Amino acid sequence: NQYIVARPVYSTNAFEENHKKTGRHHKTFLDHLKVCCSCSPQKAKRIVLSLFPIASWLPAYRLKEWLLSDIVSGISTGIVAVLQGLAFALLVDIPPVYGLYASFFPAIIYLFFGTSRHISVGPFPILSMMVGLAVSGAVSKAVPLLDDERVRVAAAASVTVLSGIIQLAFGILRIGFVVIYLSESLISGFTTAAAVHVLVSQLKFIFQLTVPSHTDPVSIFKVLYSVFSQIEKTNIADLVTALIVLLVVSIVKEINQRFKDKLPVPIPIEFIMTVIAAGVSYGCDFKNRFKVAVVGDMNPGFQPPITPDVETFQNTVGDCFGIAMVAFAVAFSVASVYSLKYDYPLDGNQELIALGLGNIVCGVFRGFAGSTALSRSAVQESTGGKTQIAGLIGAIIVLIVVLAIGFLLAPLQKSVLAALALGNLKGMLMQFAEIGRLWRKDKYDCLIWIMTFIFTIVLGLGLGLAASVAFQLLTIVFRTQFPKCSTLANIGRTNIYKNKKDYYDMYEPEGVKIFRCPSPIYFANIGFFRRKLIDAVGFSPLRILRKRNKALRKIRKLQKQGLLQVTPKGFICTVDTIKDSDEELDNNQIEVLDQPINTTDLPFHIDWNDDLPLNIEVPKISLHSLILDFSAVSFLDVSSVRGLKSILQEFIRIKVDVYIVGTDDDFIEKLNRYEFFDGEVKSSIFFLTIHDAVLHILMKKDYST
Amino acid sequence: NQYIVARPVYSTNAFEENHKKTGRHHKTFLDHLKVCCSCSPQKAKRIVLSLFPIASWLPAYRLKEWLLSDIVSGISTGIVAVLQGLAFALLVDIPPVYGLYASFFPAIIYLFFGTSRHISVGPFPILSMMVGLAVSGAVSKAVPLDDERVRVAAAASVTVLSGIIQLAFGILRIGFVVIYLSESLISGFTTAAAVHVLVSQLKFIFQLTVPSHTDPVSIFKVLYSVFSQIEKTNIADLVTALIVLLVVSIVKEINQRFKDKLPVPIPIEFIMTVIAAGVSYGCDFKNRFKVAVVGDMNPGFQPPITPDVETFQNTVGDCFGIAMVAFAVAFSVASVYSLKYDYPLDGNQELIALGLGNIVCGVFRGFAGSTALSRSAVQESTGGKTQIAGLIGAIIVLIVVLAIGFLLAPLQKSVLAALALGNLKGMLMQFAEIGRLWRKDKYDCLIWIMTFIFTIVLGLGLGLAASVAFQLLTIVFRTQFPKCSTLANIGRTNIYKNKKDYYDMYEPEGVKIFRCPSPIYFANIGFFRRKLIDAVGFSPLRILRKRNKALRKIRKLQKQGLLQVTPKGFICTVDTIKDSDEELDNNQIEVLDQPINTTDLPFHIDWNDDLPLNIEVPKISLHSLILDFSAVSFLDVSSVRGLKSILQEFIRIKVDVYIVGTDDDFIEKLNRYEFFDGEVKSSIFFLTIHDAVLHILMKKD
């Protein structure tokens, strides 16, 4: 092996002159508008196909293969959807038939505009908890037992309509990259805290204890106190049944996960023992014997459309924004997880449009918001659902439940539904090991996890997400707040430059300091970079310039006094001692000290490093070349270019050449936008790499010698 | 000027083996604990000096030179402090006397605990509006002359809580909270607050009874209330306010245009107030035209009041915002002056001093503020060497409170409103920043405009928080969509530049060089993933899946026996097989994504050459990928996992992956993330791009 290079020393300006730069037309906003507003027949066709995916992928569906698997997967996910939807309608404290409506409508709309195929559309526990809290707040704020239920369902429908409108608006405005804002740690923490919330919520149904609806913040602890205060009145039969169902569900889930290939289809434990619980409650009359709580009979058929409440809109637009954001985030996470496995593209904007239409249609017919449940999506995908048509079948099953089947689920205990919810909550609760894992791996991400969990427990599910998101954005500033700035040195008498303190027998060229900041320089870390540069060089450039200026003022005062005329080669002082006091100039004149040095009047060049006459002392500097390795510096802003230009002006004014190395051409173009370059600070300071600058310095000094 | 290098090709691992390292451990927490528990006596002395700066910098006072300047600056600043305190007491809608305590107490405490020397401690319009809004919210939320009493009680409690918060942050040794605010956000917030203060002074120029309005949209409500009563305004008050504003602006322009000519800046504010008071007292303006007057003020300080806990609960967040704004403005001004005069300034002790000042002021029935830019500018312009100027301003305010308060009785409130409007000019002039930042950098212009919109639409306290959140969001915007590029060799040398940028790039066959000029994290890893696949021209995971499917098919044919394995190549007696699709179930699809293992086959199989029995796999020319990670600064767990997935897929499709330009600390951190594995070894890292290219060339040759 041998690395042999023999080429001329290049600066970026010299690089442009030596090699021809191609003429690349720069796209402008008007040019973009030309493409956007072209309205080509092919472009219009592709746009209308994009907005209506079902027409695109309907003939592509394979009847021979996908149909059989889709039929079974749809049936399984439909049964799961019915049971779940009853459970969340319990969580929202509205009759379960509205949970059935929420299971029905969003999926049947999403079929038409659905990019993904393996997700099941409907409510999930976190979203249903947020909807319940939002309607509780709405009924609290609004100003003038069946009437209370009617008011609750009206508020839920209005909240769902508003969330659907927000999702549709974001989808039309082509903003689907909002998913990227939430990091993995934040989602993990929020999901774990929401699982704790849902467990605490289901406790009241497990013990069959009456608990008033508590709004955020600290709602979880309020519910905990309300339940534990009445722990004596706990219905023993409900607790026993819920515990039994939860135990067998957990064990069954463990069996399914352990034997994935051996087991043909996942065992429908939830449905099986929902049937068992309903039968044992109806036959033995648990409602009268042990006074258990049951969902009771539900009115068949969908409700007529309801006009959205404008008042609820004004009161809960804030909750609706969070509901829509969480719904889209969870749906897109699940859809991406399945797409990467099955290799089919997705449009985030189309996902937003589809979910917005689903929520709008659902809320118009009195159903709460719902996007996608990870558990139900897993059931549909593992069962073998190739296409979104399977979801259709699930919705049909929900319809079959709403019309004529609904009377079967009348004698079903609510504690059973709580147990089914806890069975799914177990997987979310298992994520507590992430604290230790991330603590070993990345401190900032573990901090994000812990802070998100604390915020979501202490605050609500809605405010918790916003605080966590704001906090996570802050950790980005935390990472680059204090960059480990290093001073580099040459080793092996070659172009390799490495951290000065790491290796032995490093060679540092005399009068040359190489400084590297491995972080983007913006408002957060410009002051730290300035302080670290001064620490690395060993002297303050501005202080050196000010002392030099004060010394020059003293010499000029000496010449204007006529006591000591300037020698042709130096300063000839007739008096043995200057005996000159400090000037102590006023405030207004202080800025004069900062002005650059001019030696045009002096007939001879004066170097500050050599000794000065008249007992004048200015700190000496051995630095005559400063290289800034800006390879790792990604971007700059105004607060960065201002500070950087001030630092470069201060260094140049004391005759210390500055070379910035490692930057690409787009960086120099952007720096040209900021009006960074001027007469004093030219573009010749931008060199190609560190060794090019070092060789330039050595050649310049060799010519000087 | 010839660049000549002749060294062996170096890999990071071979670099470590070849070159000795220094056993310098960076840090260990036990060492920090030992340092904290050292309790050195010189360390104790330095800590006492840090907590009590006045003892440190008082014997160092230059009585020979600084004394006269401090006296003159203190007097000229104290007069302005009295006027501004009277005006800001009206901004808060409490009696005008309570504004003087703000000028008195915090300056006195900052004398003892203050690091900076040039700033003048006291209220400023931006914080006075915030305190007024806080007390309005507090009196509204609180459950059941008296109105004035409850207003001043709420103001004192809010100030005490803000001082407690500032002191707590100071003890916690966190003073770098200022860096989270940028030049752009502060500019927009200050100009929007100047608009707020102008709208507030409108209600006093016209002398209209406008009720206290809380946020949000607290500025349009005042505009509607004022313009609704536009007929009721007094002509005399309006004309007086306009006259004082005009003369103040003209003299301000004279003072700025002639700085050297004027030895001391003209005290236009004091002269204008003196003339207004004299003309009002002489001509009996209050009885004649029913103009507003300050009136009788009770001499002396009020007895201390115990802070109301209820007010603490009601306005804790607004107190948090008040403290943040006060410290940010104070540190900005103090740093501006310290950089000019070259003296060390401690951020934490600034917080401690301002917190103590706010606490002391709030105990004695007075709202408090950090410092005014206009008053600090006056103090420095006249020339104040040492905080003894602040002390002298404090004594001036004291003698105003005790003896000569009665002089400021027949003063028009519209006059003080015009006085504030005079100083608002500096912040109102900042509207050209929109046009400048539009062409300079559009993200900063967006920060400016969004901060202005938030602060106008919402309150000051909530507007600042929303502006900070959007400020961080713009940081995410900058690196959201990096301009990922592909590089190529130019001039047969080690220089590598954008392929599209120049003419006649030589790109070595089967080598792709990819550069992402941004840190890679959660908001960036997906875009980097998509751009890499776009640049190479083929999806690595899709290639691996197709290869796995084809090779499963040939194993199926082999176990059938139709084709026989031969070292030279695949040999089939019959080539009449019909193509079939396995169509694996959902559970088994993951099997496709497993590292191709051909050890069973007796002959190596290469995917680029044609495959027998009509089996097609997308051929890839690329055989070595270089990732120029010089620009990449940091990675989180979300980006590291994605990067490992991409590298694992590329290695699984039998293409080499190198990562060049990284520092030693980068690899050390990557070791912590458990990124390295028996597959993704540490040998992939190389020093520069050309070392990797030379290694590839030697490997292929």
The answer to whether B58 and B385 have CB atoms below 8 angstroms apart is no
B480–A477 C-beta distance less than 8 A: no
Residue burial B90-100, b: 16+ Cβ < 10 Å; e: rest: bbbbbbbbbbb
Q: How many CB atoms lie within 10 A of CB A607?
A: 7
Chain A residues with CB inside 8 Å of B632's CB?
Answer: 632
Q: Which DSSP string do the residues of B354-393 spell out, in sequence order? A: HHHHHHHHHHTT----SB-HHHHHHHHHH---STHHHHHH
- Residue identified by tokens 């322009």 is B253
| Structure tokens belonging to residue B479 | 């690196």
Rounded to an integer, what distance in angstroms lies between the CA atom of residue A106 and that of residue B435? Answer: 47
Residues in chain B, total: 701
Contact A381, A70 (CB under 8 A): no
Residue of A3, A525, A634 lying closest to B5 (CB–CB): A3
CA distance B332 to B178: 8
Please check whether residue B212 is in contact with residue B136, taking contact to mean a CB–CB distance below 8 angstroms. yes
Q: Do B6 and A2 touch (CB under 8 A)?
A: yes
Residue B600 burial (10 A CB sphere; 0-12, 13-18, 19+): exposed
Query: HEC profile for B259-300?
Result: CCCCCCCCCHHHHHHHHHHHHHHHCCHHHHHCCCCCCCCCCC
> Can you spell out the DSSP letters for B323-357?
HHHHHHHHHHHHHHHHHHHT----HHHHHHHHHHH
Distance from CA of A359 to the nearest CA of B (A): 27
* Phi, psi (rounded to 5 degrees) for B496: -125, 125
Q: How many Å is the Cα radius of gyration of chain A?
A: 36
Comparing CA positions, the residue from B218, B255, B664, B254 lying closest to residue B456 is B218
Distance between CA atoms of residues A132 and A152, nearest Å: 9
CA dihedral A442, A447, A450, A455 (to 10 degrees): -150
Judge whether A17 is closer than 8 Å to chain B, CB to CB: no
Which among B4, B504, B663 is the top mutation candidate for probing chain A, defined by the most A β-carbons within 10 Å of its own β-carbon?
B663
Q: Are B339 and A594 in contact (CB under 8 A)?
A: no
The upper half-sphere exposure of residue B95, i.e. CA atoms within 13 Å in the direction of its Cβ, equals: 21
User: In whole angstroms, what separates CA A428 from the centre of its chain?
Assistant: 21
**A686 backbone dihedrals φ, ψ, rounded to 5°:** -95, 105
CB atoms within 10 A of CB B216: 14
Q: Which residues contact B171 (CB under 8 A, 6 or more apart)?
A: B352
A695 has a chain B CB within 8 A of its CB:
yes
Could you tell me the two tokens for A579? 């005996």
Q: Of A420, A424, A411, A425, nearest to A83 (Cα)? A: A420
Task: Single out the residue of B331, B349, B303, B317 nearest to residue B158, CA to CA.
Answer: B317
Can you say whether the dihedral through the CA atoms of A539, A543, A547, A552 is positive or negative?
positive
Nearest alpha-carbon partner for A624 in A593, A583, A658: A658
Contact indicator for B361, B105 with CB cutoff of 8 Å: yes
Centre a 10 Å sphere on the Cβ of residue A208 and count the other Cβ atoms it contains: 22
Q: In chain A, what are the domain boundaries?
A: 55-476, 486-539+621-704
Contact B633 A519 (CB under 8 A): yes
Closest to A299 measured CA to CA, from A146, A78, A161: A146
Taking the C-alpha atoms of residue B695 and residue B509, their distance in angstroms, rounded to an integer, is: 14
Cβ–Cβ under 8 Å, residues A194 and A126: yes
Resolution in A: 3.2
Best residue in B7, B15, B542, B587 to probe A by mutation, most A CBs within 10 Å? B7
Residue of B nearest to A544 (CA): B342
Taking the C-alpha atoms of residue B612 and residue B193, their distance in angstroms, rounded to an integer, is 76
Q: Does A19 touch chain B (CB under 8 A)?
A: yes
- For B485-538+620-700, CATH number out of 3.40.50.10610, 3.10.105.10, 3.30.750.24, 3.40.50.300 equals 3.30.750.24
Say if CB B489 and CB B693 are below 8 A apart. yes
Could you tell me the fold of the domain covering A486-539+621-704? Transcription Regulator spoIIAA (3.30.750)
A476: nearest CB among B475, B494, B590 = B475
- Give the A:B interface size as CB pairs under 8 Å: 262
Helix, strand, coil percentages in chain B from 3-state DSSP, rounded to 5: 60, 5, 35
The residues facing B6 across adjacent strands are A4
Are A84 and A376 within 8 A, CB to CB?
yes
What whole-number distance in Å separates Cα of residue A71 and Cα of residue A76?
9
CA distance B112 to B107: 9
Q: How many angstroms away from the CA of A494 is the closest CA of chain B?
A: 6
Determine the distance in angstroms separating the CA of B528 from the nearest CA of chain A, rounded to an integer: 12
Six token digits for residue A495: 């172009």
**Token pair of B660, please?**
């060049």
> What count of residues does chain A have?
705
Q: Is B71 exposed, middle or buried (0-12, 13-18, 19+ CB in 10 A)?
A: middle
Distance CA A331, CA A352 (A): 10
The neighbour count for residue A703, using CB atoms within 10 Å, is 8
Q: How far B674 CA lies from chain A's nearest CA (Å)? A: 7
- Most B CBs within 10 Å, among A380, A496, A523, to test the B interface: A523
Task: Dig out the tokens for B646 from the structure.
Answer: 């991409």
| Cβ count near A150 (within 10 Å) | 12
Provide the β-strand partners of residue A21. Answer: B502
Instruction: Name the residue facing A492 among B7, B501, B585 (closest C-beta).
Output: B7
3-state secondary structure of B495: coil
CA B127 to mean position of chain CA atoms: 20
With beta carbons under 8 A apart, name residues in chain A contacting B1: 8-9, 695-696, 699
Q: Scan residues 554-573 of B and list those with Cβ closer than 8 Å to A.
A: none
CA-to-CA distance for B114 and B122, rounded, in angstroms? 13
In chain B, which residues have their Cβ closer than 8 Å to the Cβ of A2? 6-9
Q: Which tokens is B57 given?
A: 């910098």
Question: What's the rounded Cα separation, in Å, for the pair A687 and B5?
Answer: 17
Q: List, in sequence order, every residue forming a beta bridge with A548; answer none if it has no partner.
A: none
Asked whether the beta carbons of residue A470 and residue B475 sit closer than 8 angstroms, the reply is no
Structural contact between residues B393 and B120, judged by C-beta atoms closer than 8 angstroms: yes
Q: Does A589 touch chain B (CB under 8 A)?
A: no
* Interatomic CA distance for residues A531 and B335, integer angstroms: 14
The H helix count followed by the E strand count for chain B is 28, 10
Q: With contact defined as beta carbons under 8 Å apart, do A673 and B440 qualify?
A: yes
Would you call A9 an interface residue with chain B, using a CB distance cutoff of 8 Å? yes
What type of residue is B574? Answer: V
Experimental method: cryo-EM
Say how far apart CA B83 and CA B396 lie, in whole Å.
12
Q: Which residues of B touch A586 (CB under 8 A)?
A: 383
Is residue B6 classed as helix, strand or coil in its secondary structure?
strand
Return the ∠ at Cα A688 (arms to A686 and A689), rounded to 5°: 115
Q: Which of residues 410-449 of B touch A (CB under 8 A)?
A: 437, 439-441, 443-444
Burial class of residue A682 (count of CB atoms within 10 Å of its CB; 0-12, 13-18, 19+)? exposed
State both tokens at B164: 């407690």
Q: What gap in Å lies between CA A202 and CA A197, rounded to an integer? A: 9
627-666 of A, contacting B, C-beta below 8 A: 631-635, 637-639, 642, 662, 664-666
